[PDB]
Each structure stands twice: as structure tokens, then as C-alpha cells.
Design a protein around this ligand. Sequence first.
Ligand code: ADP
Ligand code: ADP
Ligand code: ADP
Ligand code: ADP
Ligand code: MG
Ligand code: MG
Ligand code: MG
Ligand code: MG
Ligand code: MG
Ligand code: MG
Ligand code: MG
Ligand code: MG
Lengths: 340, 341, 340, 341
Amino acid sequence: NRIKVAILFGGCSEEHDVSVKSAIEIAANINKEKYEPLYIGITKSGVWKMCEKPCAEWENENCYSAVLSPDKKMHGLLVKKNHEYEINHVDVAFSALHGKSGEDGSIQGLFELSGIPFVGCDIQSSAICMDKSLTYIVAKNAGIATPAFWVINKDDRPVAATFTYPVFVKPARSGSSFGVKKVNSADELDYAIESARQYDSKILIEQAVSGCEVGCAVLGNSAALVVGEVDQIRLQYGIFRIHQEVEPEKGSENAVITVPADLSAEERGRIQETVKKIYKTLGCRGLARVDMFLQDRGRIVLNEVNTLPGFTSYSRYPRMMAAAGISLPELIDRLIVLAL
Amino acid sequence: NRIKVAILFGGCSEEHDVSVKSAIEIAANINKEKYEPLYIGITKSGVWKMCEKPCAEWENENCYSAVLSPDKKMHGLLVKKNHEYEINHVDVAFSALHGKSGEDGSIQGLFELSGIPFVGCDIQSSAICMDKSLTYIVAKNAGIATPAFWVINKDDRPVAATFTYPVFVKPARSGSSFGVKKVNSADELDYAIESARQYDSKILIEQAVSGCEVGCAVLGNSAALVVGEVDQIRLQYGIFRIHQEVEPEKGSENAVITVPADLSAEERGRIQETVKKIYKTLGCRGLARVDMFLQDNGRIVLNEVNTLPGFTSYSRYPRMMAAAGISLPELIDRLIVLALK
Amino acid sequence: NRIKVAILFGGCSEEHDVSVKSAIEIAANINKEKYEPLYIGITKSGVWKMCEKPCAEWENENCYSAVLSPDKKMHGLLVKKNHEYEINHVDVAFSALHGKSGEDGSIQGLFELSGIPFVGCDIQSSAICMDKSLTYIVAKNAGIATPAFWVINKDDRPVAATFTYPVFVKPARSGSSFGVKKVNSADELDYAIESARQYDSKILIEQAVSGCEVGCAVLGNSAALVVGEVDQIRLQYGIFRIHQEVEPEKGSENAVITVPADLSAEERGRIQETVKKIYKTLGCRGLARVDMFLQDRGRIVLNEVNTLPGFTSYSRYPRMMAAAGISLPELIDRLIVLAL
Amino acid sequence: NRIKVAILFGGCSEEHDVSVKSAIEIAANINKEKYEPLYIGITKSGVWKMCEKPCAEWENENCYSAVLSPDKKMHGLLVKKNHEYEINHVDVAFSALHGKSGEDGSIQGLFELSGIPFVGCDIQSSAICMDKSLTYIVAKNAGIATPAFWVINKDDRPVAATFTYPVFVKPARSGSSFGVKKVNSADELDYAIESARQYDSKILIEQAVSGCEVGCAVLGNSAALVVGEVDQIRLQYGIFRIHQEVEPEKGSENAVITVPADLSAEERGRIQETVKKIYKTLGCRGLARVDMFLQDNGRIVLNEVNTLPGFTSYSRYPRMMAAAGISLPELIDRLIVLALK
Ligand SMILES: Nc1ncnc2c1ncn2[C@@H]1O[C@H](COP(=O)(O)OP(=O)(O)O)[C@@H](O)[C@H]1O
Ligand SMILES: Nc1ncnc2c1ncn2[C@@H]1O[C@H](COP(=O)(O)OP(=O)(O)O)[C@@H](O)[C@H]1O
Ligand SMILES: Nc1ncnc2c1ncn2[C@@H]1O[C@H](COP(=O)(O)OP(=O)(O)O)[C@@H](O)[C@H]1O
Ligand SMILES: Nc1ncnc2c1ncn2[C@@H]1O[C@H](COP(=O)(O)OP(=O)(O)O)[C@@H](O)[C@H]1O
Ligand SMILES: [Mg+2]
Ligand SMILES: [Mg+2]
Ligand SMILES: [Mg+2]
Ligand SMILES: [Mg+2]
Ligand SMILES: [Mg+2]
Ligand SMILES: [Mg+2]
Ligand SMILES: [Mg+2]
Ligand SMILES: [Mg+2]
């Protein structure tokens, strides 16, 4: 008897497509002798459908109305396959949504109502990692260095001449680099601010952090954390934004990612231990990808924490995992077992 | 039409009983000329049902298997009638659940997915106001004083002699004083940790904060805030735990509450302004009740923020609004309108 | 029946005198209705004596040979009051030694053999906090920023022209500022190195950390940490070295200490939480004073951790404690109760 | 005179029995022309006694209530004879205790206080080599590869499925394989955590490291190091746990050890050089046995460092020295002389 895994993807969110790709690789690797996956696509306009498999043409006549119910006795989906909505049991739920709806505690809220065990972070930790400002606040309180930043509310009007350049401008709650800009001088502050506001009514302005990006993929609950190899992004210019590029699977035009990171084993361990505390400080479980800056002084600053990280074929986390000897199938399985 | 309002109540939560009470009031005051209320009760064990009305024994052979769906096109409910689930449209959602599932962003999570407009706080402010230690961290970052506290997680075994008594022990994520206790001596610490551990695997030890409790009912969305009259609780011993008492509608045994509070007009306005700053700093909307301590030194310390406050007939929030001239029919309407904004 | 508290002081150590003063204030505050203190002075040459009370003239005809025994069934002292060594029971041991012999795990080793419960840090955490290098190594591994430093072994010969000034030079294992120097330029590197070597055959050279000194007094075991108010040392020049000054009780000539620190409540909380992790990373218990640097950027660097901190009347820790509402007597009592 | 040497053995430690064995050998090889040995046994329960000699049943109505005192003028022992404690001078101390109290800097702490010269490592290197996780942290900082591991403290409850098997479970601070176990499947994890938890409130989960165990006996103080022949252990299953086996003097059931190891002269020298770097990086002196893993890739990984290695008749350390031409009478003498340096 296969464990019935609802795998949610798509979503009403600008990262919709990254999500569809995350889902296409999960589908292609989960072990189907042990798991019976139910694919729940969420369209961009927020419509829920059960389909056959995730793909770029996932929306099709064969799909049908299927939601996750909040009701604990149903513990499952309400599906319309014939002329009638029927209840189908789910053993466990693995959402692959990214960003809005998916990592911001929203889907976690339904999982919680349903009583259906699920993969990864709970509500409050998804809400804390999603709002970058909220994440710096909890991170500072635990004693984790972070960028200096200013929250720009909807009605605010920062005066540009007051900052020191460069700066980064960005939505408080997006991902995949939607709305992010390196800002080099004052007359571009506004344009950047308005762009970040296409994605959230509240945006942040960060001091630039120097150095390079070092990431750490983490797996587990509180008592025992498994980390993959540390990765490193070096940028020839601009910012990291692989999913915004044309043909991302072909390699980035401005960024080079090395794994393991080209750093001693002492430096890499250090980055991992830092990632573990960030993770514990935020109250994460299951998985998250902890992204950091490694300054030339060698000190580690938090960048952000991505709780439901990309699983695309050119994604950071599965890659960090495979390099530590955990391939995707085994990854998927341990995540599901940790949910159970 | 009238605006269809789904009113959720009960819950898989220890504040279940306070919630049914909260819902009873709301059902008795909402204006049915303007609104068509749809009552969904959730059992203590997570089962959703549409009933005619909130009451002490609301589950009846009348009550509907009925869930609010996360689907945007459905924009409403899946209701079982004739053994088949069908779609019923809803205009706005007003959750009267309290605590677990209700103030911790769980319900808000489903409301967000559904696209139905809903009353009250979003998910992150609900999560931050629900975990008391999260609220202190965020209020502190914004300049609000808070009690000193210690997070005690599930497997911790703190030595009692470490603390300076008295101390308050409590769950991180509960309400209505479930699991709360003033502990005056180390030898009582263990008892209180275990009792709190019934409502959360995580629990707080707090510095006793001196003074009296002054609360403030807040209404509005970002900026335009209305406040009620400040209320004020004096205790003869123990802690405020009115919902836990014998027949609370008849009054408290150890607590007296005054509204407006017996403080100068300038002190009251100052508390209302502190209340306001806490509200914005936490990113609340719709409503909340901001509870504080006024110390002798005149310093205002955050106690906690109750994002979906009780609406029972002896509750603090409706009573503060009412003292400011907004009685329940109206508050309800302001809340729904705010959800519709 | 009073709890019999052996209070050890003095020691074969350059901080001997600070220790005697620490002891004179403990004696003047411990509650004698609850505790029956046994004063064990250790001379500078390492001779053990039981005396009447700690004082600058503690060594006197009335004292007599008294050691702590390693034997668990004795669980006490072997005292020679008459013509014979007799065994006297001890319920608990509070050592007030500082530095060598006392905070370096040495006295903790005897406590451990004896089975007599004792105040504060165990062996490995005293050994780790004592050797500043050892402390930076464990601290880096946990992800705690520290100064950049070089271990100068006995046989090494650093070449001065290679450093960037200023630097601090210091014994790997002393305290009270014995052997410490701010070094401003290269031709003073040696003189400083030789001076630090009067106190340890291994010395360290640290990059200067900018900003000011913020300290945090911590009390407790792992599960629950009580911290006093944060303190701040600002220096008009030179280094902090109050116990090296003439007439220290009269106030320092170069340093001003504020408590609570003149910083927001957010900044102070942050320093406290950082101190808690440093403490947990090092595996401390009972008490320690965690000293940090607060950089103008606002980031917190470790300076050192002092496990058996000064209790003199002008000492940092009791002061941080009293300011948080815990006066010395209550302090002493909770430390002893935590040992028990 | 002969040099008076206090020889401590037994201990309040689970390696108590291995220690008495270690002491038996030493008493049988020390040169009594040069040295006058003074045997202090410590019971399993912490009681100190002077006896005629180390043996399986060394406690006798002959054995002395006798402690090594921390006092510098006494420079030796307080010995009970005629019901009165008296001072006996000692020249040098050689502890043959193993593990708890013996390799964790406890005994070294008393030796430091006493000013008696003593054999072996100081307090901090003993503490760092005793807590395996401490050793990995310090070796790693110095560039030595180490196993990946997880610290599991007393109240932790790790989910087993998290790990990749096989995994090694063990106490942080023990020896002789007490509490160690190769766990090949998650369902065996719990058993192994609990069994390790008998010897330490803190325990380690380690990545299985592949290859064979290659060890190295080190002799000397800072710099001038002598090393024995590299030894090498091949296992047919399970783990090396010779002291735990039936009648180990007769050999192991699952383990074969070869010395010199069956590796090129260049690989052996390289391991000895790695051994040397580990020794200095940890600040050891006197002696230690540095145990490593040689992987197929030829990489050397630290297993652990045994600061006071066993001296039984089937022990690794004496045997490595002996293969290099230094037999026990001599090693003992080199150790004492080093303590006298
Ligand atoms: N403050 C910063 N300092 C340096 N680079 C930054 C900063 N903020 C953003 N970036 C760059 O922009 C990229 C993405 O922004 P990020 O904060 O990670 O948002 P998202 O969740 O959309 O990835 C980072 O990977 C990094 O290259
Ligand atoms: N730290 C504190 N100092 C003083 N009184 C406290 C403190 N914490 C709780 N109390 C008392 O206990 C009551 C209930 O605790 P509270 O923190 O408001 O949690 P909840 O009301 O959500 O259950 C308060 O109303 C007050 O009377
Ligand atoms: N690296 C450093 N950067 C700035 N000041 C330093 C540094 N190291 C030492 N100091 C100064 O010297 C004082 C004492 O040195 P410290 O490392 O604290 O040794 P001790 O244990 O003797 O106090 C500090 O209080 C500080 O003023
Ligand atoms: N991580 C590891 N990888 C491979 N084998 C191990 C590992 N840890 C322990 N072992 C095996 O278990 C034995 C005992 O564990 P060890 O770490 O040497 O502790 P101790 O010997 O102090 O009791 C080793 O000799 C080796 O056979
Ligand atoms: Mg992101
Ligand atoms: Mg990013
Ligand atoms: Mg509450
Ligand atoms: Mg309350
Ligand atoms: Mg010091
Ligand atoms: Mg200092
Ligand atoms: Mg060992
Ligand atoms: Mg071993």
C-alpha cells in the first residue's frame, strides 16, 4: 500500500513557473513503488486541479476540480471526477509552491486545519522567513549579523540623497529575484522602489553586503540537522537571478556557482554551523535553504532563508544535497518521512 | 442581496467554549437586514459543519458538513446536501475562532488561498501576535518595553532556584489564561511548567511585571485607527482568568475592571497611543485588543495582543468600544466593511 | 544545619590578589545563617591553609594545613588543627581563584575527583575559556565573530613589518590584563611579545577590534539563563586594566563603565542573547562573564569569557547583577544552590 | 635514592578494568633499580588506596588510605598509617587511569595543583582529546579531516530517518568502545543512543568513515617527537572493541591488526607525519596514540586521540613502540624522564 502524497504546485504567485519546474523534477524522482503521488496544480488565477503529472501543459481536459479540505475527519481532498465531489484520503502533503501562497504560511495554514502531515516549515517560521524584514528582526535578536535595511511602507517616500550606494531594493515578500535591483546611485532609487512594489506593497532597501553568496541546504528537525555541501555564487556583475534569465538551464550569463564551495573545510563547516543556528533561530523544520553572504573579512551575514527552495534541475538545494551523497529520490523520501 | 457572511466558530482549540460564546453574541447582533450570516462550527476535533446558529449545543441533526474551500473560483463553500457536496458563494468571512487554528494564521491561510475578503489580521501578524515570545521580539525591535522572559522548550529542565520570584509560567501560544500561573516560589515551578505544557510544546517563564493591566481596543486598517476607552484591571490576588472562573457572566472573584480606566485623560490617551504604535509595529489590521501593563513609574509594558478578541457578553473588547459609543451591531458592521475595503 | 561551603582563594597565580579581594567580598555577603563557610587560602607559593576569614593579612598563625582531598568517600578536607590530619566534610565548594590554577580546569579537576558539588564551569569549558585561542576556535566553529589572531609559540619570531597596526598582544591564558598591550607600531611588537611571555609560554597577537566593550553577566545552566544588565567600558586611551591601576577602588584613570549600558533596549537585549550563545557554545554552567566588543556598525565580536569573574567591590559581574535586582548575597546563594 | 613514582590506577570510570591491566604491565616493567613505585588504586567508587601492587584483586587488608595532595610543599601524598595521615614525598606521578577522571584533565588538575612532575598531557589537551567533538573541532581548525558528526544532548530526540546509514553512535567522552556501535539502519538508532547514554549525557552520531584504521604511537614533548611503527586494523564486521571481547588476551574475534601496517614506506611515514601534526595541533605532550582512518582515496581522517593509551599486554601503543625497538621498560623510562625534563 503506497503512501498517498499530495504534491501541490503552481500557485497564485509570480514564482508560479519556477514552482511548476520544481514539481516536474519531484514527479520524475519520487519513488512510485512507495508513494502514490496525487498532483494538485494551482493555476495562476488560484483554481485548484488534480492532474496526471506536472508539466508545462499540466492544465488539461483530464484534470478536474480538486481541493484540499480543512476538515480533520476528511483528512484529504474533495475531488470532482464524475458529476460528484468525493473525498479522497491523503497520507501526507508536500507542497512545492514557492513564494506567495506557498511559503508564506498560507498553504501551511490549510495543512494545519486538515491535520494532514506535511513537509517542511510550519506557519510561523514560513511567515518569518518570507518577510525578509521579519527575518532580519528575528535573526538580529538571536545575534546573527544581517544587512542594514529600511522598511519602506506603501506611503513612504525615501529621499535618495540620503543613502550611501550601492543598495539593494526588493519586495519584503517575493523570491526568485522578482523586483530586486542593485542600485548604484541615487537617481535610480525610485525606479527601483517602484519596480519592487509591483510585487509587495511593502519593500525594503538594504545596504550592499560585500563578498560572495554562500548557501547551505538543511534537512531535519531541531534535534538533528543534515546539511549538504556549501555552495558559492560569484557574480561577474549584477545580481543572482538565474530564473529570470533566458534559457536558465543553459547556465547563467552573469553568475558562476561552485559546489562544493572553493573554501577550506574549516570555512565550509563554519558556514554550515552558522546556517544551523539561523535555522533554529527562525524555528524551521523539514527543510530550508539558508543563504548567506561571506565577507572578505570572512564574516558571515544572512541574506535570506528560503523554506520551500527550488527543486528545478538547475536549483541550489538538490544540488547541494546530491553533492553530499543524497540524491533527489532519497531526498524526497526523507522529507516525506520527516513529515510523517 | 444581503452580503453573505461566513461566520466560523468553535474550533479544535482549548478556547473552543469561549469561541462559541463569542459567536453567540455576534449572531445576536449582526444586522440581518444587511447581512446573511452563514454559521460554520468546527468541532473540538476539527469537523466542519453548517448550522442554523451558534449555541451551546449547536451540533444538531440540522448542522451541515460544510467547508470553506481554498479555491478562488468557488469563492465560498463546499456544502453537503443530499449526500453531495455543492458550491455556495460567500462574500466575506468573519472568523470567531480563538487561539489554536484561529489566531495563529491557520484560518487566515485558508482565507488567503480562497480570495474571500475576511475580517482581522493577516497570517504573519496573527503568527507573531500568537507566539508571545515572537510578539516580544518584534515589539522590542520597535521600541516597546516588554517583560523579560525565558523560552523553555519541550525537553528543557530548568533549575527553579535560578529565577527571582514571582514568575509567570505560560504556554507560548494559548489564550484565556489556559496554562497560565503566577508562581511565587521555586518549588511551584515544575507544577506550572507541566500544566502550561498541556497547551504548547513551547512555554514561557516571564518576569513578573508590576502595575495594573490596561487594555486598548483597536479598530481599523493601517493608519486610520479607532480606539475604544481604555479599560483597567485590578486584581486582589492571582491573575486575570475570567473565562476559567465559576460562572464568569456573573463576575470575577479576584478581578475588577474599570472602564474608562481611572487615570487622567492624558494618561489614557498615551496608552491609546502606545496601543496604536504596537498595532502598526505588528502589522495588524481589522482589529485587535492590545493589552498592556501600566507600571507605577508610568511606564507602559506590552502584556500581549489578542488578534481575534473575545466577543462574549462580559468581554473586554466590545465593552471598550461600547464605552466609546460603538455598540456590537455597529462594530460588527465596521469590521465587515473594513474586510470589504 | 548550615550547608558547609569551602571557599577557596588566593592561588599560585598572578591574579592572586584580585582573588583575595574577590573572596573578601564573598565572605562579607554570604548568608551565615544558611551557610557555614570554610576559608581555604592558597598561598602564592601553592600552600593550602584553612583560615578564619579572607583579608589581606589572611595568612596567620591561626591558619593550619588543610587540603581538599580527591577521595570521594572523604568528600571533604584533610585538616591539621591539632597534631593530626582530620577529615572534614564539605557540602559544596565555591572557588574564587582566578586565572592559573583556578579557571583553567585545575581546581575543577580536584572538585571532580572529590565528588564535592561545586560552583560554576566544568573542566573542559574552563580550559576552553582560559586559553583565549581555544576560545576563538570554538567560538568561530559556532559562528560567533571573533578578532583575527595569531598564536605565537615559544619558538616563533613574528616579523613585525608584517602586521597592520594597531594590535593587541597578550598571554594565551592570563586575566586581569597581565601581559596585555595595545601595540601601535612595529617597533614595539617585540617588547610587547616579551612582556606577554612573562605570563605564558604561548602568547597571542590579535587584530584590534574597534568600538567599545560590552559585557554580560550570566547565571545558570543550559536550560535557563539569567543575565544581568549589560555594561559598557569606554576608554579615553590605552586598555581596560582597572586591577593594574593604583588604588582601583577609587575609579579608573582611563576607563568609564556605565550600567546599564547607554544603548537602546533593543541593543542591550541583542548583546545579552549573543552572550547566551557564546556561553552555550563554550559549554559553561553556573556563571561566567561574557565580554564582547560592540562595533560602530553595531556588530558584536567576542573578546573573552571569564568563568570565575572578579567579585571585588569594583568588579563587573556583581555590579551587572545588582543592577538587574540581584544583590551579592542572593547571588552567592543562587550560585551555591545551582552547584547543589 | 631511587626516583619515587606514584602510579595511579583503577578509577571511578568504566575503563577501570582496562586500567588495572594497564597498571599490571607497568608494574611489571618499570625498572626498580632506578625507580621506587608507589601504587595508588582508586576504587570504582572513588576511594584512594596505597597497595603493594596492581593486580586483579589489588584491594587487600594491606592497601593504604592514601591521597595525592594538591599542596606544593607536601609535594606528594597524605598516607594513613596508625590511623593518622602522614606526608610522603613523591618525585613524579604517572597516572595509568583511563577515560573518566583519567584522560579528561581531572587527574591532571590535581597534578598541576601539587607541582609534582607527571607523565602525559596537560589539562586542556586532555579535555580536548577526551570530548571527541571537541577534538574534531580543534583538528578541523588545524586542517585535519574529520568525520561529519551530530552532537545529541541529553533531552534530544532525533528522528532516525534523517540520517544516511550506516552511522556510528557513541558517548562523547568514553573509551574502549564502551557505548559504541555501528548502526546500519534507522530502526536501530534508539537502541544505540540509549546505550551510549550510559556513559555520557552527551553522545555523538558520526558519518561512517570508510577505510581501515591506522594508528600511531607518539612520544615526546612539543617538537622532538618519536613515533612507533604504524599499526593497522582490518575488521571482518562490526567495530574494533577488543577490551569488550571474551578473553581479549587470546585475540579478537572480528579484528586483525598488523604492524607494521601493510602499506608502502612512504604511506607509513605520511601517516606518522599526519599523526605528528595532530599531536602538536592538539597541544599534547608526553605521549598519546593518534588513531586515524586511511581511506581508499588515500585520505587520512582523524578517528580519535587517546591521551593515556592502554598499556595492557595486547595494547596498540606498547606494541607499536616495541615494533620500533622500544620495549616497555624503556618506554616507561622515557615517559618518566620526559615528565622530569
Ligand atoms: N543586500 C544585498 N547585498 C548584496 N547582494 C544582494 C543584497 N540583496 C540582494 N542581493 C543580491 O540579489 C540576489 C537576490 O535577492 P534576495 O534577497 O536573495 O531575494 P530573492 O528571494 O528574490 O532571492 C541575491 O542573490 C544577491 O545577489
Ligand atoms: N509577566 C506578567 N506580569 C504580570 N502579570 C502577568 C504576566 N503574565 C501574565 N500575567 C497575568 O496573567 C494573565 C494571563 O496571561 P496572558 O499573558 O495575558 O495570556 P493569555 O491571556 O493569552 O492566556 C494576565 O491577564 C495577567 O493577569
Ligand atoms: N583585540 C582587541 N581589540 C581591542 N581591545 C582589546 C583587544 N584585546 C585586548 N583588548 C583590550 O585589553 C583589555 C584586556 O584584554 P583581555 O583580552 O580582555 O585579557 P584579560 O583576560 O587579561 O582581560 C580589554 O579589556 C580591551 O580593552
Ligand atoms: N565514524 C566512524 N567510522 C568508522 N568506524 C568508526 C567510526 N567511529 C567509530 N568507529 C569504530 O568504532 C571503534 C571505537 O570507537 P572510537 O571512536 O575509537 O571510540 P573509543 O575507542 O574511545 O571507545 C573504532 O575503533 C572503529 O572500529
Ligand atoms: Mg527567496
Ligand atoms: Mg535569494
Ligand atoms: Mg491572549
Ligand atoms: Mg490575556
Ligand atoms: Mg580574562
Ligand atoms: Mg578581559
Ligand atoms: Mg578512545
Ligand atoms: Mg578507539
